[PDB]
């Protein structure tokens, strides 16, 4: 069951005509919040993470390759740049651009049919947000290269907490505003009203899943007995709290959001039913032997 292109690998197709039609029509010119979804390949995340950690506490960055399907940015590769940078400020003077177009020209022959879809930057341990000059960077990147998104990575937070600190951001055009609050400015920038985040999800290939499932498990009291359904109790409480506001906004709209709210609630209920199933299978495995 590998020769056929399943629903998992169907995203690995680069249709030149469809992308050309999308880039010619330009539906994003009218709707400012046109893009919402950001799908990212696994290996891009891997290369990004290893490049961020290889530089240590020095900021590193690169250009990513991908396409756009409707309102979803599908990124299929990451790439490193030969730049010199400090903890907070970088230049990318000439070496990056001497290894940017040359890399594209080289990749045109190996089989890489993708083009520039955005850039990722590593912020070492000071949040996932668009800086005061990075917002202008995405300003002039989007003003002429409309299919585009800025990716921000925190290496220190990911390496310490254990969760991927990834953020996909796009900015509003100058003039589109819709005194600063004290809760949306610490997790964002001082120009938080000038940019918004996009939902981020990842995809992989069928052979990737097959290799992962046979790589190494052990994980008997590491996964099969790990206080499941309980470790993310704070996550579930936060989710069940914000579904209240989601449903109340949906009801106000009724007096569409409701499908999104139902999907959001279904995700949590399915996750915790999976936790219950794991607990039940553990009970049937260990407790009920040798009565």
């Amino acid at each position: 069951n590998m020769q056929e292109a399943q629903s998992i690998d169907e995203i690995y197709k680069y249709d030149k005509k469809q992308q050309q039609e999308i880039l010619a029509a330009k539906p994003w010119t009218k709707d400012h919040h046109y893009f919402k979804y950001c799908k990212i390949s696994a290996l891009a995340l891997l290369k990004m993470v290893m490049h961020a950690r290889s530089g240590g506490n020095l900021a590193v960055m690169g250009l990513m390759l991908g396409k756009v399907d409707g309102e979803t940015m599908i990124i299929m590769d990451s790439f490193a740049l030969p730049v010199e940078g400090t903890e907070t400020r970088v230049n990318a003077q000439a070496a990056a651009y001497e290894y940017m177009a040359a890399y594209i020209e080289n990749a045109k022959q190996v089989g890489r049919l993708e083009n520039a879809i955005g850039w990722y930057h590593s912020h070492p341990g000071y949040g996932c947000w668009l800086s005061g000059i990075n917002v202008s960077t995405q300003m002039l990147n989007q003003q002429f290269q409309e299919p585009f998104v800025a990716v921000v990575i925190d290496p220190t937070r990911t390496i310490s907490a254990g969760k991927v600190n990834l953020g996909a951001f796009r900015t509003y055009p100058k003039g589109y505003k819709p005194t600063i609050p004290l809760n949306k400015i610490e997790d964002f920038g001082v120009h938080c009203k000038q940019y918004y985040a996009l939902e981020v999800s990842y995809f992989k290939s069928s052979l990737d899943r097959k290799l992962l499932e046979l790589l190494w498990n052990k994980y008997w009291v590491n996964t099969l007995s790990s206080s499941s359904l309980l470790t993310n109790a704070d996550y579930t409480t936060g989710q069940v709290f914000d579904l209240s506001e989601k449903l109340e906004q949906s009801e106000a709209q009724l007096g569409d959001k409701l499908a999104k709210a139902t999907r959001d609630s279904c995700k949590t209920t399915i996750e915790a039913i999976h936790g219950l199933m794991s607990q039940v299978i553990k009970d049937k495995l260990f407790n009920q032997i040798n009565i």
């Binding site: 903890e87 907070t88 000071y126 949040g127 800086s131 005061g132 400015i185 610490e186 001082v190």
Partner: protein, 350 residues
């Protein structure tokens, strides 16, 4: 600014010409508005210190005019330097009141060694400028005992402090020879004459052996006691020469000459005033610059000052004043140009 301080000192020194306070206060208003368009008041106030150090002598000022001008300066300047000049004035006033108290104590409890007049004018160390560690010139017996009893009195009352008597500055008079003439000497000359007294035929090496006379500032006094004296001609040396190295023998002579009974050698004050930090300053500048760009830590208004001095290993190198001036001059463009009204956002951790 040195010129402005010179002009202010010259105008305030001689209040006979234009004793009206209106013209003086209009001059001070002009000086204040001229200083307003200018900056860098640190050199301005260190020059104030230099001129007022060489107030230590006879007042020859108006006092209340200085109080008025310093009050009008503090109205628009603030604290620290204005407060230390207020400390100057408060120190002088409390010194004169303590002198009055000591005189009252001497009158109440009679002390024979208090017959000599004492005009102790103790100062403070945290506000007044410092010159050096000062020498340890020997004190004659009677002044030594008078200062000892004054020290004993001052260790009483309010305790917790000592008095390190200096010798760089001071005004004294002495009765000499024949009509008795009153001469004016300044500390070192007093001890030199006292040593001359008990035995004649005293040479320079003998004086230098047991007086702890200074080395660098000795040059000014050595060429002031002779080599260009006025018509008074109180004392001369038999080795008449421009330079006197080691063995010029001094002699005591009557030399009555002038009939004036208040001959003074204050003229030496009118002529004695005439006439590697590179690596340290480079290191300080580089440290300040790397601290201001590198830190970028979350601050509101003061924790940045804490972390910058935390980063350094040795102290007195930070010197928070340089951080203050750097962050003050750092507002010229976008970076560190945040709102004074709400000093909350400071690029946070970026």
């Amino acid at each position: 600014p040195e010129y402005l301080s010179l002009f202010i000192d010259d105008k305030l020194k001689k209040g006979v010409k234009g004793l009206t306070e209106q013209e003086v206060e209009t001059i001070l208003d002009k000086a204040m508005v001229l200083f307003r368009f200018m900056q860098e008041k640190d050199v301005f106030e260190r020059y104030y210190k230099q001129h007022l150090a060489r107030l230590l002598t006879n007042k020859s000022v108006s006092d209340d005019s200085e109080k008025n001008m310093i009050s009008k300066l503090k109205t628009e300047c603030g604290c620290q330097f204005t407060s230390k000049l207020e400390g100057m004035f408060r120190d002088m006033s409390i010194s004169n009141t303590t002198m009055d108290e000591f005189r009252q104590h001497l009158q109440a409890t009679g002390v024979s060694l208090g017959g000599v007049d004492l005009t102790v004018r103790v100062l403070t160390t945290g506000y007044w400028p410092t010159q050096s560690a000062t020498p340890k010139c020997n004190i004659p017996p009677a002044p030594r005992h008078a200062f000892e009893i004054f020290r004993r009195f001052y260790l009483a009352k309010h305790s917790g402090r000592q008095l390190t008597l200096q010798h760089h500055m001071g005004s004294a008079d002495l009765n000499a020879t024949t009509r008795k003439h009153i001469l004016q000497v300044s500390t070192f000359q007093m001890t030199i004459l006292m040593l001359f007294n008990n035995r004649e035929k005293y040479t320079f090496e003998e004086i230098q052996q047991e007086t702890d006379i200074p080395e660098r500032e000795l040059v000014r006094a050595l060429q002031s006691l002779a080599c260009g004296k006025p018509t008074q001609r109180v004392l001369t040396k038999e080795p008449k020469s421009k330079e006197i190295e080691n063995g010029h023998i001094f002699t005591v002579n009557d030399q009555f000459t002038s009939k004036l009974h208040r001959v003074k050698i204050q003229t030496v004050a009118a002529k004695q005033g005439e006439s590697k930090v590179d690596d340290d300053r480079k290191h300080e500048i580089e440290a300040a610059i790397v601290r201001i760009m590198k830190s970028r830590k979350k601050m509101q208004h003061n924790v940045l000052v804490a972390e910058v001095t935390q980063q350094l290993k040795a102290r007195f190198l930070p010197s928070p004043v340089v951080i203050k001036k750097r962050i003050e001059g750092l507002i010229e463009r976008e970076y560190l140009a945040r709102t004074p009204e709400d000093r909350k956002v400071y690029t946070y951790v970026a």
